[PDB]
Design a binder for this molecule. Structure first.
Ligand SMILES: O=C(O)[C@@](O)(COP(=O)(O)O)[C@H](O)[C@H](O)COP(=O)(O)O
Ligand SMILES: [Mg+2]
Lengths: 445, 108, 108
């Protein structure tokens, strides 16, 4: 027991292996090969002890090995440890198992002061066992008939207080004014002041009465997060019986077991799934501890869900290169290796559909040319007060964003620089709309 | 009256903006072609506007690199059907999706 | 003919009584305000009369203590929509309910 039986510098990973990257720094004095070897051991076999039983098995086959050590640029005591795991260690189509194995124990191990899971390469043999998105980008655009432009959303406020009927009152106003989605807030489950069978039924009327008046398909992500899985399926089946197209779930707080059961219920029943990344900043935020959100985005694309919050837009989450890095991984089918965007591995998804990139949290009308240049067309833009905060109401507010979005698209197509000519793509649009002309005066500038 | 917003019936994309000039159609068509997509013209009676399949005209312009033909194939569909919407589409063969979809003529 | 009662189509409250005088609207509005409720004006086409949501005008008068403004905001909704019902509502914020709900103008 001293390791360097897990430090294989000559090994060439198979195409069936599951690779991983760790940004690590260990105790003072111990060489890097030993401390990365300890990460190799404690995340697979966590050994060698001395037992009679550990000789009943060929343990050189199930061992995880560290084949490369690289230095973090800009830091000295840290390093990158690339570790390879055999495909036999994991259950097929189980993402609850792949994290329980990797991050289940190594984070408590004592010799490491700092450890961060940065990336994972999944092999094509593992990807094909997982369910994946229930629909994807190209199937959602088919079912909703929305082409050539990003989608628009709003989150109903006040979060706390509205009855089932006043809720549907405010849902009806934002939809009938230009948006195509509204959102249940993450808190809204089934509170005493608004039970869920009363919210579900009055929203179903506000959606169906705005779909007919505008002549466009509209929706509202109803929150089917619950305390039990029997309760979650019950809300999902209520929502499908009311004829609704889309629902919502919280995968970090409700768990991957529930998220994957819901994601495969949506394929047999033809529903869409919107995912909220609640309690992500507890894990992902600090730059030396925990998991990067990139890895929790890959696990989400593997488990299910057609849209995922990426946020956060004030004025954005901020670098842009890191964000554009895992937006590629949510959407593309093959992603090369680029260190600037923090992709440590070449990742191939084959034919697995992409996931919509939802931008959120505090957008206003002057942010459109920067959110169309950065995110592209396979994005959803969700404001909370951008729609509701308009001096004339919630329908005149939605009518101002839908005019400023379609003016930024049609100027991107025609070869103009949207993120650079933003003021004449907007002031020349307000000449033909008094709803936007007053919105540009409020949220100046 | 201000501010009393009235719900308006629209098509979908570019519906909230005024009708496009001839010069705007040029640049949208040029963008559609420069992405490598295939143009495609449709039309319906404005009452059947929410059908899942409109009506072709005539076949998608597979591998057409000239926008001076599509601006003349749009007045033909319009003159032949002067009470129809005239849509303009951009077929993407690798993704099996549509990169563009906006009504050009509204239906006299 | 007596006594042959004919079923009549009504709205709901105060529907069986004759249309209200201007002075009656004063006292109902004054009662609505004196309970602490918020006035709210709606209208629909008399055919869409059984919709669950009518149409606002323009925003609920949150914290308005003057009934000389609401009697003038009722002729505005009527003149702007001379073929609509004009309802008068009283929003209760603590109970999340409506303490009043009666049609004022019937739709010319
Ligand atoms: O802080 C702001 O600027 C807003 O309140 C908008 O103000 P205005 O209403 O004055 O525009 C943001 O919408 C919310 O903070 C979060 O967004 P949301 O609630 O949409 O998720
Ligand atoms: Mg902002």
């Amino acid at each position: 027991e001293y390791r360097d039986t897990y430090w294989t510098p000559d090994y060439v990973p198979l195409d069936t292996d599951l690779l991983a990257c760790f940004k690590c720094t260990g105790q003072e004095g111990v060489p890097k090969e030993e401390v990365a070897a300890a990460v190799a051991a404690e995340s697979s076999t966590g050994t060698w002890s001395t037992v009679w039983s550990e000789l009943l098995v060929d343990l050189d086959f199930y061992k995880g090995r560290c084949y490369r050590i690289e230095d973090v640029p800009g830091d000295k005591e840290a390093f990158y440890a690339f570790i390879a795991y055999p495909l036999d260690l994991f259950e097929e189509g189980s993402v609850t198992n792949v994290l329980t194995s990797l991050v289940g124990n190594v984070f408590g191990f004592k010799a490491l002061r700092h450890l961060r899971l940065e990336d994972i390469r999944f092999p094509m043999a593992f990807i094909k066992t997982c369910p994946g998105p229930p629909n994807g980008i190209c199937v959602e655009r088919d079912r909703m008939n929305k082409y050539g432009r990003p989608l628009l959303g709003c989150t109903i406020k006040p979060k706390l207080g509205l009855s089932g009927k006043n809720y549907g009152r405010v849902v009806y106003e934002c939809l009938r004014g230009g948006l195509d989605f509204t959102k249940d807030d993450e808190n809204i489950n089934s509170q005493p002041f608004q039970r869920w069978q009363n919210r579900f039924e009055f929203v179903a009327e506000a959606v169906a009465l705005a779909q007919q008046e505008t002549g466009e398909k509209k929706g509202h992500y109803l929150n089917c997060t619950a305390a039990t899985p029997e309760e979650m399926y019950e809300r999902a089946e209520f929502a499908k019986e009311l004829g609704q197209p889309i629902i919502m779930h919280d995968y970090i707080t409700g768990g991957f077991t529930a998220n994957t059961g819901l994601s495969k219920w949506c394929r047999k029943n033809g529903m869409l799934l919107h995912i909220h990344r609640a309690m992500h900043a507890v894990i992902d935020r600090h730059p030396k501890h925990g998991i990067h959100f990139r890895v929790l985005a890959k696990c989400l694309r593997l488990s299910g869900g057609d849209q995922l919050h990426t946020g956060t837009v004030v004025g954005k989450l901020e670098d842009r290169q890191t964000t554009l890095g895992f937006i590629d991984q949510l959407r593309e089918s093959f992603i090369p290796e680029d260190r600037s965007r923090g992709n440590f591995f070449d990742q191939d998804w084959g034919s697995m559909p992409g996931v919509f990139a939802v931008a959120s949290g505090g957008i206003h009308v002057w942010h459109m040319p920067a959110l169309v240049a950065i995110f592209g067309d396979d994005s959803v833009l969700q404001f909370g007060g951008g729609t509701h905060g308009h001096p004339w109401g919630s329908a005149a507010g939605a009518a101002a964003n839908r005019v400023a979005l379609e003016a930024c698209v049609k100027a991107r197509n025609a070869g103009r620089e949207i993120e650079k000519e933003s003021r004449d793509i907007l002031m020349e649009a307000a000449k033909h709309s008094p709803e936007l002309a007053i919105a540009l005066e409020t949220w100046k500038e | 009256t201000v501010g009393d917003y009235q719900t308006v019936a629209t098509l979908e994309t570019f519906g909230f903006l005024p009708p496009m000039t001839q010069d705007e159609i040029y640049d949208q068509i040029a963008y559609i072609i420069a992405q490598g997509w295939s143009p495609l013209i449709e039309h319906v009676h404005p009452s059947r506007s929410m059908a899942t399949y409109w009506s072709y005209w005539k076949l998608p312009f597979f591998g057409e690199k000239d926008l001076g033909v599509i601006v003349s194939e749009l007045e033909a569909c319009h003159r032949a059907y002067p009470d129809h919407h005239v849509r303009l589409v951009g077929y993407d063969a690798y993704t099996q999706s549509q990169g563009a979809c906006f009504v050009v003529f509204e239906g006299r």
